[PDB]
Design a protein around this ligand. Structure first.
Ligand SMILES: CCCCCCCC/C=C\CCCCCCCC(=O)O
Ligand SMILES: CCCCCCCC/C=C\CCCCCCCC(=O)O
Lengths: 131, 131
């Protein structure tokens, strides 16, 4: 996933509070999240890919092998099972917990990285540019 | 309530989508409501006060006597019991339905009319100026 490696900074967000509401994130955490302008750092070492998100409030980091299910504790503190595959040049992540699931797709668009988050028909789009 | 009579147009809104989420309004109706810039028309005839809200999408109208509980069907189609009193120069409305309640306060602030909506600790503020 060489096209993804680097440090990226958030440029725009669309419908992310609606997505967080659908996931069940509480009011105060949604308000902190809408104030954060995270940096995303992606790196690869052998067959482990790492995605780190850094903000004043909370940093998250996951390291995984593409295709192997793993445990992840999300920024809003859900304990989920995640699997990320490389499909059509995009990193496609599915998180499952309590009989629910959500899909987070990270893809390149021009010189940007676009994150699309989908939960039961609500879709949010976040655009990042290279820092 | 002479200080309220007139036609008013929305100038700003703060946290109204969060208030609607707390009330239980669905995604599409919340999206229509956030696109509307309603006009509010208040008039008095004898002891009946009328508050009408007009938008491209939906008009609502309630007529009431201050202090007498009445039936109201809200813009998002809840059937509620409402009572509005005049307290401290503000119109204070309480709506009750299914064991829940929310308070909508309409007050003058300078040359503006301010609507404050409260549902379980989430507060939204909408400011109107004379049309
Ligand atoms: C005090 C907590 C501060 C941080 C709160 C962040 C809350 C985020 C909420 C839900 C996580 C959803 C999963 C991440 C989606 C991708 C976001 C992105 O990379 O832009
Ligand atoms: C197709 C429907 C179009 C209109 C949708 C409007 C939805 C409003 C949602 C909930 C009603 C809450 C009660 C009104 C609060 C006061 C609003 C105001 O006067 O500014």
């Amino acid at each position: 996933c060489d096209a993804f490696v680097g440090t990226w900074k958030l440029v725009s967000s669309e419908n992310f509070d609606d997505y967080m509401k659908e996931v069940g994130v509480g009011f105060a955490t949604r308000k902190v999240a809408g104030m954060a302008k995270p940096n995303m750092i992606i790196s690869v070492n052998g067959d482990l890919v790492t995605i780190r998100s850094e903000s004043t409030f909370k940093n998250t980091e996951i390291s995984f092998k593409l295709g192997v299910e793993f445990d992840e504790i999300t920024a809003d503190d859900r304990k989920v099972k995640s699997i990320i595959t490389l499909d059509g040049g995009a990193l496609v992540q599915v998180q499952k917990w309590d009989g629910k699931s959500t899909t987070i797709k990270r893809k390149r668009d021009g010189d940007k990285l676009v994150v699309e988050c989908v939960m039961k028909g609500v879709t949010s789009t976040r655009v990042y540019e290279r820092a």
